[PDB]
Write a protein that binds this DNA or RNA. Structure first.
Lengths: 148, 209
RNA sequence: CCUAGUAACGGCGAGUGAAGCGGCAACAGCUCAAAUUUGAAAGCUGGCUUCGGCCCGCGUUGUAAUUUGGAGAGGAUGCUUUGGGCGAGGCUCCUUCUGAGUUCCCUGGAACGGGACGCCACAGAGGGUGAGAGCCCCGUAUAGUUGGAAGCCAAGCCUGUGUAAAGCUCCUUCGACGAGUCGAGUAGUUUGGGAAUGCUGCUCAAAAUGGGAGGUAAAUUUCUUCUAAAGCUAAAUACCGGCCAGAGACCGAUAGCGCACAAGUAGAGUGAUCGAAAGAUGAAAAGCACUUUGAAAAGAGGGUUAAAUAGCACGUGAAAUUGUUGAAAGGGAAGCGCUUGUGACCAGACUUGCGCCCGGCGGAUCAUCCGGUGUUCUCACCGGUGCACUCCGCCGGGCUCAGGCCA
RNA sequence: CCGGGACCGAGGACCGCGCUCUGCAAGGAUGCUGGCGUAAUGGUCACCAGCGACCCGUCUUGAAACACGGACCAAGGAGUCAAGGUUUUGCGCGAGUGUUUGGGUGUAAAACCCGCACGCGUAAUGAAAGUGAACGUAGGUGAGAGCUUCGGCGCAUCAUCGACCGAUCCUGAUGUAUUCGGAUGGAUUUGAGUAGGAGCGUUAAGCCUUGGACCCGAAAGAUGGUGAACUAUGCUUGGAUAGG
RNA sequence: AGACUAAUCGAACCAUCUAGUAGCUGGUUACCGCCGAAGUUUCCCUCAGGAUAGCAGUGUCGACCUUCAGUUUUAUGAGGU
RNA sequence: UUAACUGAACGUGGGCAUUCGAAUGUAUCGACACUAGUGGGCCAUUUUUGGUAAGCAGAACUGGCGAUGCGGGAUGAACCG
RNA sequence: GUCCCACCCAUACCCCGCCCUCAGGGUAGAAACGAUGCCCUGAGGAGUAGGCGGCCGUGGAGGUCAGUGACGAAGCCUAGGGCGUGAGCCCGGGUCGAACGGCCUCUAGUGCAGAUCUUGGUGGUAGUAGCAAAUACUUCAAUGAGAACUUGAAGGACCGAAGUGGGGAAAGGUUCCAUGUGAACAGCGGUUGGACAUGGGUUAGUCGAUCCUAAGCCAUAGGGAAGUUCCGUUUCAAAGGGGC
RNA sequence: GCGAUGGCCAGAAAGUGGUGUUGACGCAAUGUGAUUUCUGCCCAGUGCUCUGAAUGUCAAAGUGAAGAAAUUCAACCAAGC
RNA sequence: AUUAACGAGAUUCCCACUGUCCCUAUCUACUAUCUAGCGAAACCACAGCCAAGGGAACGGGCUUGGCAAAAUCAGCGGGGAA
RNA sequence: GUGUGAAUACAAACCAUGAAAGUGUGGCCUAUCGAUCCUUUAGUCCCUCGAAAUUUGAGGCUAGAGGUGCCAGAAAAGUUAC
């Protein structure tokens, strides 16, 4: 909508708000990132430190699929079972059954461990697992298998 | 000419891009044309479905390894096991994949089940009405409700194996002897040192003897 | 569409920049060289023929059948499969036909305008007729209906039939597979391709479990996946150049294409080429008969029209600039701001209102009660009774209050 | 304590502070009277009169300038659009969010419905192989709006001392494919981290980059074509120039 | 003679690339209200120009925290005009 | 760290307000976000450098013109109010 | 030169009225309110470059006024009125002939004095500069509305055979002749015209072109070049013509 | 400078061209400028030209050695300098 | 270095000649001039009397003074930094 | 309140000197010098060459050197009197 924009309030004032001494010429300073090392160095060194230079080794023909392994913490593990079944377990009316959660189906590969866990035995099937995660799931009463 | 804190721009507008701009102002119009073509195709193939049977297939990378999907055609070994002539198969709507082959036995077993229950649901009008043959339909179980999609009636039942199950306590197994984190570390280090360890062993035996 | 502004290239500066996987649209598979039919060139252009054939020619330095890696050839074994002719009925194209007022009054030159009364509607999209017309006219909506030509799809019927050809299951053994090509060195160009991604020129020039590829140069030993140097084939995709059709929160004659008009025309240059300006009388020309002045162009009367303040220099007709009439000022500029004065011209406001007393006129009907209805449930409406010191309207006289401008 | 003059009259029932207290000069003007009821008061325009008054736009420390543009009138005439960022305002959902590449349907370029994948966010750090976030009621201290049984509990945020994850430098337990593994404990080191999630889509404004980029403006450079009717040189074929 | 090559020659004329680039001249269209500057520091083949800090506007949030001050007094230090 | 519970930092508990320990003001407290113009200056009292001097060139604290009309110096951006 | 009385006026100071901006308060058992309203109190107002807020106009789109109009819509003229501080809005009088407004949202090719701006039109200068090379005209009569530049007769002159004579090549294209004629052209006039209108006019065995070659151009045999095409004209060619 | 297997010059190339229907009393490239009288010294510098005994320098290809290979190390080495 | 002849080549002197000059005067033709007919252009912020002052340091406009009378014709080259 | 040059006070090691307390992180103090890319050396015994191994080769991480004097750092000869 152009009916309310600052260009409609400039009609009648010569120079259209761009100044009388500096007249808004075409390209004073150069096009693009010109002068990066010469007259725009102050900007490129107060901000963006690290722009120039080379670092690290290179890698020909990277295939991103080789590096697919999304993770999941340990406090969100209980959010993988439906709500109605979940409340039955946490409220304490089963006492004799344990859920076998399969991370791979729900789209996870590694089970990291960050939070706490309630003292109910479970069974986890993962591709990768961390040292801290293993300890917590084991002291709760369950075990973790490797499935590939 | 940067003036403030911004993100360093990179806009690939430096050729004569204005000469190659594509606008899709005919999105609804095309849709209408496609639907007209489908109805014409459906009317030409009067009693037959529109699509063609595909087999079940597992995705080929380590990512996406879990899901399954439809393939292109059935392999020659699959057709032979179900007992279907090599040349008759394409005519009756079953496809064929010149260049796929079966390594395991679950995909083989899955696909032969697919063919077998399809042949049970297949009618087959004779080539001439006045002279029926032995492999044709006997003209009395010939009137029934038919399907036309063949993608919904024969799609993948479940791409991903059930998320979770339940088992009685005191039936949960025990892990690997020492941990399940030490198991991974050990299995990694072994493959790292396969070359050196074997070489050292071989030299000692030959040198001693 | 996403991968992705990612891996990578780059005076590693400015900048440049793909591919695999994943979801969908559309789906369709195949033929030649390398084999001896060898118990019978079984093949083909041309000419003549009466339609059955014949003649010359091509060709054994290889024309048909058979085979193309999915295999296949050669063997057994038992099963199964294969020709013609009709054809209801349906789908495309053009062409015949389709409901309702011009009723009554007013303004107007002319109703398609205003008022009163009606009718049709699977049709109130659009245009014309003397001004905004659903019913004056063309068309518009729905499924049939008149007639005709050429094609397609197709329910189901009637007919032959073998040692000709085809398909499946097993096997000792065989199993032919594209050369100045692949590859290497060197030079140039190009790519994101980095001890060199593709292409091309020059030099060297292969092999049979061989060869290529496996994104960092080399040697040794394994592994994975395909089978090049011969060929054909619809659909999803691009485009307004050609032929047609439907539309727009687009422009409205200095705009919109250079062109709404006898526009790529008139015109300029030796030439390649450059390239405009220009829409609108009135409903209907009814485009001014006749008299008179003038050599004529034309003028004045007189006519047509609702209007000539529409007269082919024609709808409406602004400003710059000019003429006539009326008013005013002017001793080397004019215009302008604050404040009076003279002259000309002019908008407002006031011209009564309310109340009380007395007299006259006319009317239905004040308080109260009874019945019915509504509603905010205690306040009202309608019908009857109520009949003159009650109520209402008007006129005449008197009185209080207020109301315009300057002081 | 008594005179003389000028300018002004805002507000619109009582409510107040007071005094000389049947009232008042106390929280803002009333009373009596005259002429005229129209050009009289008032307004617009033209002219004379007293005082004042250099031509606009622009560059510039400085313009009325002997600085530049401008004879007059009518119409045309200049910060826009797209992709990608960023902060702020309004809206929907919320650990999730986003239908429209596509399909179904339709009174048909409208409106309505559908879901597999996918993008951003939910986890960081190293060049990399890799590893990967709780001792405490998710800590202690000083302030903090608010609540409170009055003792205290203390959101957001500010300052400070600690704890945990990755990288770097030391330390080197039980074990053992005897050369593999790296527990435990430290360090004037380091991170775009954790420590009871805040994001995704869309609307509007300012700003930035590439684009013809607010509008008009070069001396040059390249690709492809047309000219010896003037003039330069030459070839073939012709013509012309008294009398001493 | 840098002379002539269609009034054009120290490199002809015509169309396209082409709206070629400009740190340089010129212009940039209605009204009212509130706030209201700089020609200075550092860097650049920088000196008719840019980035950076400063001066300015708008939008807010935390309290109404009771803190602050281009100033004076009292006590106590430094200076070489 | 010291010969040492001798110190150093951070602390628990208690005591000292009856008056929180000079004047004046508080017509303006703290923090954050995004961004415009500017980056040629000139004049004056006092101090002062080069120059014979200049309506010349170059500096320090402050006040002005630029960006500002009004009354006075007859006239005049910088003077007096 | 020093001292002492009175007096004169700034947009400065004091008091009062009015406008706006900013700040602080009151207003529901609602007899209540464009609550974005009303009422009470105090202070302030200069400004280029620049920032923000509020309002007014133009061309189109959705909704609504059951809006105006041939008994006169839009447009234009008007020292005729009213409103607003202002951009602007509303009415009276004249001309004209078919469509047009108010309110809330959406949308943009949206507001002009300048740019030696673009196109079109018109002025002062101004009835001014000027219409002066090539020796030159005069009398009578006729036609005609009108005669210096039409015709006849008579005078006076010039070109003075390297002519202002008589014919041609290039170029021009009906300009040649007759009859008639309003306006336009013949830089004055015009009955006259190379102008305007209507008709007519160019005859070849003997004059040319057609035939032959010159300087030169282009096919064929061949060889280059990605190609449009460049070379090649007797060349490394099986190239013909005469009789019955 | 040149005896045609050649000198000077055109062309992208060619079974292509100009000088050339030419052959040193000729073709091609330069300087001075009638006649008369003359035209001195300098080969260090910049150019042009001449002979390869001298080995100083030296590319691709070729030769020898090490290595399992990529590769590295050595001689030999045309014209020009 | 000289050099006969030649030159619309540059330079100095002499004889004859003359309005080049002392020093100006007169005559003829065609315009300019007036009339009848026809009839443009450059240029132009507004315009057009001076002296001094200050000012962007040389004003037509400002301040202080001088002054100041309609409408016009032929010449002129100070100024309008034409 | 960026970089370069230079400087100050500690911490953890290993040392010199002195009987000892102590002193010493270049010259008694104020100047004496240098980015990205590339090459080269030192260090661990470290990571990678992405089908799997072993040795060559190459690429990485940390610290120095090869230099920009226009010294916050382009690679660069004249004339125009056409």
């Amino acid at each position: 909508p152009t009916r309310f924009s600052k260009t409609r309030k400039h009609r009648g004032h010569v120079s259209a708000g761009k100044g009388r001494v500096g007249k808004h010429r075409k390209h004073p300073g150069g096009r693009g990132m010109a002068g990066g090392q010469h007259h725009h160095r102050t900007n490129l060194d107060k901000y963006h430190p690290g722009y120039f230079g080379k670092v690290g080794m290179r890698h020909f023909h990277l295939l991103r699929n080789h590096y697919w392994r999304p993770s999941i913490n340990i406090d969100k593990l209980w959010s993988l079972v439906p709500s109605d079944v979940r409340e039955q377990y946490l409220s304490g009316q089963k006492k004799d059954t344990a859920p076998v959660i399969d991370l791979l189906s729900h789209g996870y590969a590694k089970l990291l461990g960050k939070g706490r866990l309630p003292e109910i035995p479970v069974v986890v099937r993962a591709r990768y697992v961390s040292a801290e995660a293993e300890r917590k799931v084991k002291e709760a009463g369950g075990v973790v298998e490797l499935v590939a | 000419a940067i003036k403030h804190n911004q993100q360093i721009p990179n806009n690939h507008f430096r050729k004569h891009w204005q000469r190659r701009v594509r606008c899709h102002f005919d999105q609804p119009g095309k849709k209408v044309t496609r639907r007209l073509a489908r109805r014409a195709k459906a009317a030409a193939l009067a009693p037959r479905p529109v699509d063609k049977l595909r087999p079940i297939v597992r995705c080929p990378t380590v990512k996406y390894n879990r899901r399954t999907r439809l393939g292109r055609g059935f392999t020659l070994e699959e057709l032979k096991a179900a007992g279907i002539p090599r040349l008759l198969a394409p005519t009756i709507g079953i496809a064929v994949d010149h260049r796929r082959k079966n390594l395991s036995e679950e995909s083989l077993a899955a696909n032969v089940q697919r063919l077998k229950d399809y042949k049970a649901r297949l009618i087959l009008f004779p080539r001439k009405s006045n002279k029926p043959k032995k492999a044709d339909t006997p003209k009395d179980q010939q009137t029934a409700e038919t399907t036309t999609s063949l993608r919904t009636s024969f799609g993948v039942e479940q791409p991903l194996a059930p998320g979770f199950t339940e088992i009685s306590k005191s039936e949960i197994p025990a892990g690997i002897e020492g941990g399940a984190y030490r198991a991974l570390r050990k299995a990694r280090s072994d493959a790292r040192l396969v070359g050196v360890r074997e070489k050292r062993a071989k030299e000692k035996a030959e040198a001693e003897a």
